[PDB]
Design a protein around this ligand. Structure first.
Ligand SMILES: [Ca+2]
Ligand SMILES: [Ca+2]
Lengths: 313, 318
């Protein structure tokens, strides 16, 4: 009964494969249509993440061996532990968190963008392994894995977020997904930024920057999709979601402070890494469309560290 | 006399994240350990699939325009429909089938190999889109999407496999996943190879060969993991699984014959594409460790087609 001829009527008469599977094997399934992109932001993001493909073997980490050998065994242990803990977060994102966003998608193109995210964060975990292969001894590697499984403050950050990935609530799942690359990343990234400012491990620093380039987009994209769904909710449901975001973030900030104090206690870096972490919590809120409540002193970052965001050593 | 006298013990004291969720949020979670690979085959496959990364910008598809313009509207429509049907299979693999194998994995490294498979088959679907953007009118593209959703013989092939991806039986899910790149692909791939053997759409067939290079590994790897797990099961369960594989493959073959007859009906290609399909069904069985029951007559492929199928894929780098 329409007086205009709407193009692509087949789309409204069909379902994506995941929708077919979720709704009890009902409906006619449509192929993705890369010639009709429902949200142009999806095409922009697909193009940037695929143009940004890299693998760790492209960076000659072996050229860091002399720099690595200037670090005491205590510093080498700290780096192996910190990076292995980040590898755990990468593993959760690749195998649970990002793949859980596929069925939560607003568009067919978003469904496969999250498969790229999952694969690329697996590459991030691969690259930590690659760094260790070149620089670390077998004993250093194994001891870091045993420390990861046995450090309760580390385990608790992951345990707090994983339950949301059931997609019992898709928006809560998306917030918990974005908190990995948008927040928990940074307490650990403080360490390579600190080492880079001191002229250590330049080639490893190149891998850290490639990882950062991907993670920034992952956080941005989830926040973009969070805001798009939330704006369509009732004012009441939007208030409930905003209180959820602040509550979960504050909970994760407390868990992260406890973890970073343990990780960096012997080195004095915990207070600086916590302010750096809380600064990025403020940006995480902005990424979801909210205002940062954090103070300047809460979030103060030295310039040699702050620029990389884009006698006593 | 003599003096009376375990590496990586943490691994047995912990679980992977997907397990931790599976076990009801119980256990200590371990990071993937790329320095201690439990099955070296996983490192080999990770290295192969990542070094084979490509995007459709690698291929100068616009150089096919002269030969595309020599095809009739009916042939152009056949090509667009066939490829859009393949894009549906790609979409199912990227968003349902390959994702579903992550929790079925025997090792931590296999979990992330299947995330590569899902993304790369998404690239396959995007590549079809690139071909359509270069060659097809907006009307041809939309017609093909409307034909895909409304063609029951096409839909039935997908509907037969998707229920297994719920993972009630992880081995049945894995077989049903592998049937996509290992079998359902080939009836459609017959068309570009038929065309390029006749000098039509040569650059498009270069895309097809890059897709094939990935799909072959996806099928091989699922068959490797299938065999590894099945080999540890009771003789009764192994024979049950063999019967399941043959029963499902034969039912898929029947659905594929019905679809290819409908798809190719005005063109005379269905009988040839069906033999090409059944040839690859035989290879599918061999890849799971079984013997092919199909005759030489059921599986004949002409040399010019085999030449296109077997040609190697390739200053632009990734
Ligand atoms: Ca300090
Ligand atoms: Ca014929």
């Amino acid at each position: 009964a329409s007086m205009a001829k709407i193009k692509n009527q087949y789309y409204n008469e069909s379902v994506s494969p995941i929708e077919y599977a979720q709704q009890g094997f009902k409906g006619k399934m449509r192929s993705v249509n890369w010639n009709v992109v429902n949200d142009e932001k999806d095409l922009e993001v697909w193009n940037r993440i695929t143009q940004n493909f890299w693998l760790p073997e492209k960076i000659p980490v072996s050229n860091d061996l002399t720099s690595w050998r200037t670090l005491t065994p205590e510093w080498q242990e700290l780096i192996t532990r910190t990076f292995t803990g980040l590898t755990l977060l990468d593993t959760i994102q690749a195998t649970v968190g990002d793949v859980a966003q596929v069925p939560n998608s607003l568009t067919d193109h978003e469904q496969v963008i999250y498969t790229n995210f999952a694969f690329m964060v697996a590459v991030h975990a691969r690259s930590y392994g690659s760094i260790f292969s070149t620089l670390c001894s077998s004993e250093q590697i194994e001891e870091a894995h045993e420390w990861v499984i046995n450090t309760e403050t580390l385990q608790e950050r992951a345990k707090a977020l994983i339950p949301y990935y059931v997609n019992d609530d898709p928006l809560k799942s998306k917030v918990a997904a974005a908190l990995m690359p948008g927040f928990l990343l940074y307490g650990g990234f403080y360490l390579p930024f600190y080492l880079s400012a001191r002229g250590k491990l330049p080639n490893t620093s190149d891998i850290i920057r490639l990882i950062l380039r991907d993670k920034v987009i992952h956080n941005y994209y989830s926040g973009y999709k969070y805001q798009k769904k939330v704006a369509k909710l009732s004012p009441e449901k939007q208030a409930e979601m905003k209180e959820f975001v602040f509550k979960l973030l504050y909970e994760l900030i407390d868990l992260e402070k406890a973890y970073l104090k343990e990780l960096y206690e012997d080195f004095g870096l915990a207070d600086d890494a916590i302010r750096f972490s809380v600064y990025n919590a403020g940006k995480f809120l902005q990424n979801l469309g909210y205002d940062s409540p954090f103070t300047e002193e809460e979030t103060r970052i030295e310039p040699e560290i702050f620029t990389q965001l884009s006698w006593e050593f």
